[PDB]
Structure 1
């Protein structure tokens, strides 16, 4: 009598938001059709998935007024560090180990 209730439950998000770290080969978008087109350093897939070719960063931007045009970049900078806490924790591991 109900007839109804047959939903699939599939999942298809954006996997790596703008300005995350893209491994090589990692998937940027798993999509149904082509919302975001491939820009440069990304490859389309069989089912329009968009995956990173080289490590770097993902940049969502319009490739036309309407289109997303996802892209990737090397993005390597900042070697410099400023955190005391990490050094402190490491220092404690050793001091306590020595004490005990």
Structure 2
């Protein structure tokens, strides 16, 4: 009734190395910000963009990230600064942060 249990020859792994897209498409970046840790060139380097020893793709300039279409079934990544970025005190966020600030000041 009490038979022996056979050992395995498995049970080894490496904890997920945390690759993938760090800075997404149409998003803020920096000079030096790592955009993608990819194991090979899944995405390819575009304009304004360095490519490192590990095929790590990082931005050289400010601006928003762009994942372009390369030609025959591949992907690029370029970075573009943005011209004018308007802010209106009309809006809800602007209204509410000024309301909050004014409450803070009013209390103390």
Counterparts in 2 of 1:97 and 1:55: CA distance versus 1, 3 Å: closer
Whether contact under 8 Å (1:23, 1:55) holds in the other structure is: yes
Q: Which has the higher strand share?
A: 2
**Structure 1 residues without counterparts, runs of 5 or longer:** none
Partner residue, 1:81:
88
For 2:62 and 2:50, locate their aligned partners in 1 and report how far apart those are by CA, in whole Å.
Answer: 13
**Structure 2 residues without counterparts, runs of 5 or longer:** 1-7
Runs (4 or more) in structure 1 with deviation over 6 Å come to none
Whether contact under 8 Å (1:59, 1:72) holds in the other structure is: yes
- 1:42-77 CA-partner distances (Å, limit 9, x unpaired): 011010000000001111112212111111111132
- Provide TM-score, normalisation by structure 2: 0.75
Counterparts in 2 of 1:85 and 1:9: CA distance versus 1, 3 Å: same
Question: Which structure would you say has the larger Rg?
Answer: 2
- Provide TM-score, normalisation by structure 1: 0.80
Counterparts in 2 of 1:53 and 1:89: CA distance versus 1, 3 Å: same
Whether contact under 8 Å (1:37, 1:68) holds in the other structure is: yes
Whether contact under 8 Å (2:63, 2:80) holds in the other structure is: yes
Give the CA RMSD over aligned residues: 2.3
Partner residue, 2:42:
35
For 2:56 and 2:32, locate their aligned partners in 1 and report how far apart those are by CA, in whole Å.
Answer: 11
Q: Number of aligned residue pairs: give it.
A: 100
**What is the CA-CA distance between 1:93 and the residue it aligns to?**
5.0
